[PDB]
Amino acid sequence: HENSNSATEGSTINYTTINYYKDSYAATAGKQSAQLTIGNSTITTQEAANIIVGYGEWPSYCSDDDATAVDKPTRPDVSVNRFYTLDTKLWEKSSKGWYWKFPDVLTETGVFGQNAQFHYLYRSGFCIHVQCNASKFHQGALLVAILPEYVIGTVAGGTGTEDSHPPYIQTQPGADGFELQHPYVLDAGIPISQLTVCPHQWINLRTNNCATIIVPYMNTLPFDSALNHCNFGLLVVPISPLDFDQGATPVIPITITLAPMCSEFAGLRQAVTQ
Amino acid sequence: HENSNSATEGSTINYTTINYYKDSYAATAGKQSAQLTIGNSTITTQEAANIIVGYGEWPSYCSDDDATAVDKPTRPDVSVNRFYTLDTKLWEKSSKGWYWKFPDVLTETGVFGQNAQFHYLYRSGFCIHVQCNASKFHQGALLVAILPEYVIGTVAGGTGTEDSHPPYIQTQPGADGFELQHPYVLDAGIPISQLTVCPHQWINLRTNNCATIIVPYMNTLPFDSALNHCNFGLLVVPISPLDFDQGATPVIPITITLAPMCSEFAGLRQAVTQ
Amino acid sequence: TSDESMIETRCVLNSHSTAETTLDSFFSRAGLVGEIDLPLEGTTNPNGYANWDIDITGCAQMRRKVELFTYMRFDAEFTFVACTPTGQVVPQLLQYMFVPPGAPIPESRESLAWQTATNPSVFVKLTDPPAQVSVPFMSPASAYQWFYDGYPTFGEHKQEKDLEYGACPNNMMGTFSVRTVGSSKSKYALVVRIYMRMKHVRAWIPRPMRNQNYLFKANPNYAGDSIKPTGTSRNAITTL
Amino acid sequence: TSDESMIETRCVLNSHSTAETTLDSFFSRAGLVGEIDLPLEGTTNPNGYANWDIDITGCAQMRRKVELFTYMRFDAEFTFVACTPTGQVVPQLLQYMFVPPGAPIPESRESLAWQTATNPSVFVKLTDPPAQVSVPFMSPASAYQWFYDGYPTFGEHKQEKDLEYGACPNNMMGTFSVRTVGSSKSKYALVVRIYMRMKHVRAWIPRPMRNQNYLFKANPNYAGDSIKPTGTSRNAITTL
Amino acid sequence: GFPTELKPGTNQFLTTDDGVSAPILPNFHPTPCIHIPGEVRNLLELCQVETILEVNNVPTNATSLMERLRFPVSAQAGKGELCAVFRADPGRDGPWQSTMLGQLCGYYTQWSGSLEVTFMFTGSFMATGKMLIAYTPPGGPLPKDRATAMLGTHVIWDFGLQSSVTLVIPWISNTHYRAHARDGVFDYYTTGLVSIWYQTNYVVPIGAPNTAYIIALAAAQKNFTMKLCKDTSHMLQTASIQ
Amino acid sequence: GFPTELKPGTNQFLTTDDGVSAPILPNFHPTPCIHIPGEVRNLLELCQVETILEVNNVPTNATSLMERLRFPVSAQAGKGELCAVFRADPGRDGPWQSTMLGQLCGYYTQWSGSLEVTFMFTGSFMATGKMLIAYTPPGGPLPKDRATAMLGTHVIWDFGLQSSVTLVIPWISNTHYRAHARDGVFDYYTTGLVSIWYQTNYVVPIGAPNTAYIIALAAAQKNFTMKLCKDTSHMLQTASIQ
Amino acid sequence: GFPTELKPGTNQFLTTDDGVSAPILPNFHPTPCIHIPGEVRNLLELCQV
Amino acid sequence: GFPTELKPGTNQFLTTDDGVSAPILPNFHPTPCIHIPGEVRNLLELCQV
Amino acid sequence: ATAMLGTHVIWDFGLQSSVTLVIPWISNTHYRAHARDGVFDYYTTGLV
């Protein structure tokens, strides 16, 4: 008598609702009822205290129930699924924080960058190794965090009247990344104090030198453009500032090492950079 | 509790509807769940690549569930069910296109023409052989198509203010047929680009010289007047223009060969031409 | 033709529904089919009554959807939305008489046809919600006929009655008659907008969707010097 | 971590329900998502019609609740509360047309789009209770996207079209179109307040709840010189 | 009577409300439905019918509107010359508006599924040659070369040997449905481009015409669907119907 | 028709009325829900996630807002010196507004259940020392000494040995739920105080910094609930959204 | 009370609406129908005369 | 919709009408009722004191 | 950033005092005949 067409039809949750129409969406809300290796690459995760799996979900390939694109996607599986090391960011005493957009960091690097450029569609999760070596006499903490759909906001002219939008070097800063001008609101008006509801790991220098967050592919879509859409933003921010006495190593680098996990590329055409 | 009197009662489709009245039409819309010979005549269909059966339906006789007229219809079966060849139309380089109305082409020809004139009621399908011989050095394509209830529109005075209606030589042009003044809108305001949703066949001269569309009787009624009502219009239109080099045969005729299929005539009276 | 006859294909477990492209879901959306002025002054329908020849080809959005098909058999939910020309909801009582063919068409507002002993009438106020009735498939034919290639009558089809061409009397379902229910002239100018929601739709013979401007209700006439293309255009075929 | 890992603990037979912190009970409360002026004079929407780009990020209370999550898939009960600027309930009939993307957006009050042969329209009076409809989850995506880190189109993302950043067309569900149903200009200045009650809510990816003042509907922009703390403050950390 | 409570949707006229209304004729039975040929029960039956794609949507001239239905393959210099170009979006303003698929795509917001474009060579039997018909997935711009375009989905069409090819435009999308790309932010929903390239050349002997024509017949595959049934923009009424 | 009687609630629009409304699209099926990571089905999943507690909510300066997320353990005179103080109320205006627990506590009137505050020492590996983190039950004022504060619920945190302690603030209330204490009569619903005391001292060798920082990460336990879903006061809009 | 929603046909008087109306006489029984000759149950009986 | 007929008591607010009203909080569960001494279930318990 | 495209190991040497770079046998030929700075650089294993 009724189209099974509410928003929770495909979900695993039973709903006792009231309906009077042939559309299930017309119904009531109702109530219910250590060496890591990938590719030709190897990292070390002895001092991280665990590896964070983003939302408890391993980066699987696209489910055939879940995909829409009828073209056979390519899975290069070693040549693109491998640790990619970006250029280092120097953690300083005045380091506000940096972000990296994904897979915008890797659309210009490796066969992953070519597969991102040559294919319209892209799907991968990510093993993100953020490492920061410091001595036992250095101190400071990094919130290494994965903010999905990290839409950058502007200062809006500072006052708030100008409707600015962040430039392409800011929304998609590539493998270099972009600093946080305002890490407290994450350049997005949302507090970094609540950033740990996102997949996060602390680089507390006394405790661990590296953070390994393993991120699944997070989208409303089974695949997307690797060039336009950035599925998430990795945020590496000094919540506790870097401190050391003079004589200790002042150059404290944060190296960002990225494994695309189960990369899947569909819609092959010419190589397009953006 | 309810009259079975909706518009979909006789259909083969089950409907789960909501009703509160004794009329089923008051309910909701709801949701669901090669030599061809006839008569004394023979054509050749070796180069047509198939024969198009209009809407997948062979021209049967009138079903006894489907008929209303209580008089016994005559079925001459050979003398009227036979290939009728009309006068040729010369496909030219500037040929806009022609149409033929049915069975208006054949109300003045043969025993079919006499049975159409002597009977008020008429029912037949049609085997329509449209043939166009051209050499392997000629080129061009014809959309041979069957537009049912091909109501001709006018130019409306050109500007659109005059409420013109097409004359009887234009609505019912007989066996000679009428050219398309505007084949793009089929002299009816409807695009010829979408004419292939109707039963159609291409005479692509490199591929096939003839088109054989077999049309069933299409009406809201089991029988109708052959003189007033034209059940369909055959449209033979040069989508791709006729082209050849000088020296090849410039006279490229389109011969229209028509078999009324399972002709049924009821309501015998005097011979009436219109 | 297929797609792994064409490219390399992955298994797509496709649960994409076709239920919204059915004839019900395409046609069971009420659209404007007629708008009736009942003005105070003027010559349109000045005596507080109006006789609308039932013809859903007067409004082009509904007309183009139905003329996608040649034959359509449907029941129809007819909703009559009455207001003023300003859209005001005034305290006025209307009679909506379905006058079938052969029934006495009302000559005036005080006509004896409005006694409606056998005609279906809706007495509704404008303050009431828009009067809504199911009409059946009422044709003597087995489908309605947006395209009747022919003539109703016999005889010499001369040009002073070429207007009978296309006129299917199996489509002429009568007159929709609206009056203000009173012996005196109504106090408000009224607009009765007629909305038809088809239901239990069966449709035969898909046609080319009309790519010209509709000009007249009874015919498929098009502006001859203003024949527009079916779609938009461009400067060259090699560019966009 | 536990509490008898922490202190001495007594047995508390705790029957405290979590049913009000579900996504239904948090989001199936109708909140203002848009308010449409249909004034008599002015430049706002002066011709008795208005075209509202459907965007629930214009009112900050609803916007902050939905931007708790990145992705939200829901049906929505849309309630349209129409009155005057004084809140008066005047006898005026409105047409609420859902104009989906690609459908003809009404250019005027007498537009042919209002014939609504295929668009969903609500004809309601202001004297009627506030017009209430369930919309489905209508996105081409599997969830709506309050945050789209990226661009809709390809090409050189230069600064004269940086406004495409964040613009998810999987969120652009079309135009809500409201007119007064009339060929004449309406007699009352009207305010159509739109209240959306989400239902059958699924939400993914919890986000930090916006701690700055929202400034624009399409972007997460914040006032740069007026960056307030997430909460209130105090003189010292050792005191209260 | 029975205690009832009117909800907010009371007295509204939703035009898509599938409700029960009062029957005007209490015991009317309709004329019985005879069998009529060509019953459509679903509009996707019309989407799967190949209708003429107006790839040559240049000649707006009323004497030249029939030239829109076909486009000129001619003898070239033997490179990968560009013959024709069209976007693969059925609901877009352009070449697809001539199709029944495209006009029914006017009545729906979102479409999904593979599209077929049948290219019919209408030259002479003696005319021969090869076409590269390349569907470009949405990220790629207009390919400057044929050697840029064969990186996409493409078919090699020997038209002297096979008079009708079918370019199946595969459903290759990020989203499960596409909401009808326009030249704006909805170009997110572009299907991509279809470009026709001379793979060899239009090779013609003496006596056969040096210019031929391709009739493109675009349709939809059986996996095609539409949703969110909307008013159409592909045909606006301008003159009032008298 | 059927004899019905309209009750007083007729024609009202209750915004929390879970009713059936008329569907605008009669046979629309949505885009099928793909699996997306991070599905929340209940807001208490977010309450149990440790978010940074802004115990150092002194620096309102925009250049110093990141100093709010952490607070300075430094080398002391070896007494029970007061390091930091915050009320244990998640819905209160103060340090808990920076938390996801506290911001979701803005959307509910009443909360029940134990709270966790994770204190993360972010000094050097060579930095050592002990903290007394004392949760005071609601009757106790601000403890003047550490020897007043250890009478309450407290943990001894050796931060050189254990870089992260968790002060479980136990649900200790007269009422089964607390309706979000304010500085007024709703201080009846105060959870009490959390005060940080130097249990030994911040002991540092040469070469390691004499000042370190504690990031407090506050959350809720699994026994935590909320009820009476209300509008939030923790974020008021001031500028109109253009 | 019970949550109801008035549809567009509310408060109209369709003259051919076969509805239930309130009985003016609560326990009236009619005069019993005697047999009368010439009962027509269908107007087609008159068409065939 | 379903043919209904409003009776005379429609839209009255009888203060002793034991009716169903719309709940303002869709999934609110109350604080669980602890045992309190001195529960009166009937006022005649007080009359007998 | 050019070198991590090859076979590489990340060696935290303060944490792991001995890493082992396994140079994998990656060759066109089944054996390598000892590359020299000439035409036998065909048999180079590559660079570390």
Ligand SMILES: CCCCCCCCCCCCC/C=C\[C@@H](O)[C@@H](N)CO
């Ligand atoms: C009692 C309240 C009045 C109820 C109104 C009764 C309307 C039912 C009429 C069914 C609609 C079918 C119209 C069919 C063809 C027409 O469009 C032709 N003129 C086209 O050529």
Ligand SMILES: CCCCCCCCCCCCC/C=C\[C@@H](O)[C@@H](N)CO
């Ligand atoms: C027939 C009566 C009219 C019925 C009104 C139809 C409204 C349905 C619309 C579903 C609401 C979802 C909005 C999602 C995102 C938007 O907020 C974006 N702009 C945010 O970026």
